[PDB]
Amino acid sequence: KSPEELKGIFEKYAAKEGDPNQLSKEELKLLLQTEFPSLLKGMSTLDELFEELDKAGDGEVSFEEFQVLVKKISQ
């Protein structure tokens, strides 16, 4: 369930940036705020989090990179 749900979520957020398969920092943030209010801890952390998370993509988090985030969320 969770993988599919999170893929759906991910895709729906991504689509807002036109690119149906990728989350820019703001999209990643926005999604994390809405879906996971506390995971971000404090806004600034997005820098570190995104830097770590988006290892390959750098600019935009693909579902590949996002699954690294999922491995943290655990659900």
Side-chain angles (χ1 to χ4, degrees):
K1 175 55 175 175
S2 330
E4 302 173 278
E5 185 61 67
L6 302 155
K7 195 177 182 180
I9 284 175
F10 169 91
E11 187 180 271
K12 290 170 186 298
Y13 279 100
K16 307 299 183 181
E17 310 292 67
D19 184 335
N21 66 253
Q22 241 179 166
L23 304 171
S24 307
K25 308 97 170 57
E26 298 182 85
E27 203 65 38
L28 184 281
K29 187 193 192 300
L30 174 63
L31 177 176
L32 260 51
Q33 310 320 268
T34 311
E35 308 308 311
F36 308 131
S38 41
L39 184 145
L40 50 275
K41 186 176 89 293
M43 309 313 181
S44 323
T45 316
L46 181 77
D47 175 80
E48 300 175 284
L49 182 60
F50 200 94
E51 184 178 68
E52 189 180 292
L53 194 189
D54 197 11
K55 184 54 65 280
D58 183 83
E60 277 59 49
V61 164
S62 65
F63 188 62
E64 306 158 294
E65 303 303 270
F66 196 77
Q67 285 162 106
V68 188
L69 203 290
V70 182
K71 289 187 291 184
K72 305 184 180 178
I73 91 188
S74 305
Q75 195 294 304

